[PDB]
Amino acid sequence: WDLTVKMLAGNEFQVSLSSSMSVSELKAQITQKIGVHAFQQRLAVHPSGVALQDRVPLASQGLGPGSTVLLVVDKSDEPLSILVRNNKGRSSTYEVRLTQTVAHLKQQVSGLEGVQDDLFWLTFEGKPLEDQLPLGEYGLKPLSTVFMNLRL
Numbered sequence: 001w002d003l004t005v006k007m008l009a010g011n012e013f014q015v016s017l018s019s020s021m022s023v024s025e026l027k028a029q030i031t032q033k034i035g036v037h038a039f040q041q042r043l044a045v046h047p048s049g050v051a052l053q054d055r056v057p058l059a060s061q062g063l064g065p066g067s068t069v070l071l072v073v074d075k076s077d078e079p080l081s082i083l084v085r086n087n088k089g090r091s092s093t094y095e096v097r098l099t100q101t102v103a104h105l106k107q108q109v110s111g112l113e114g115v116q117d118d119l120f121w122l123t124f125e126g127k128p129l130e131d132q133l134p135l136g137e138y139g140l141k142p143l144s145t146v147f148m149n150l151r152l
């Protein structure tokens with residue numbers, strides 16, 4: 001549908017939802033417009049003033065065509081240290097930013113483990129990480145442990 005995104009810091013712009021129309025799709029539109037990552041987006045329904053449900057559909061959330069949502073962007077991109085456990089079980093500390101991509105992390109890991117980046121993939125809390133997405137998308141925190149998986 002046609003949705004208005006009002007910023008407390010900016011002005012406002014429209015967006016269109018074309019499919020199941022979920023919270024993710026919305027953020028994908030925001031990113032399309034201002035280039036800010038999804039995980040850096042803070043959204044609330046206007047004027048109810050309540051944050052959105054990442055699981056609940058926009059429809060059954062008091063949002064539809066002509067509705068307004070409030071957006072505040074998180075700028076900060078301070079480095080933090082995370083752990084990556086290798087095949088043998090040994091973990092190593094990496095200094096990263098939540099805005100860097102999984103692919104970038106892999107390159108770092110690869111360079112440190114002397115293993116071609118294409119011979120393994122990474123996982124966190126059982127779910128694999130996608131090369132094109134930013135680390136912040138998986139809720140990594142200090143000393144979080146990401147696992148290396150050999151494509152053997």
Ligand SMILES: [Os+4]
Nearest residue numbers: 007008010011
């Ligand atoms: Os404004």
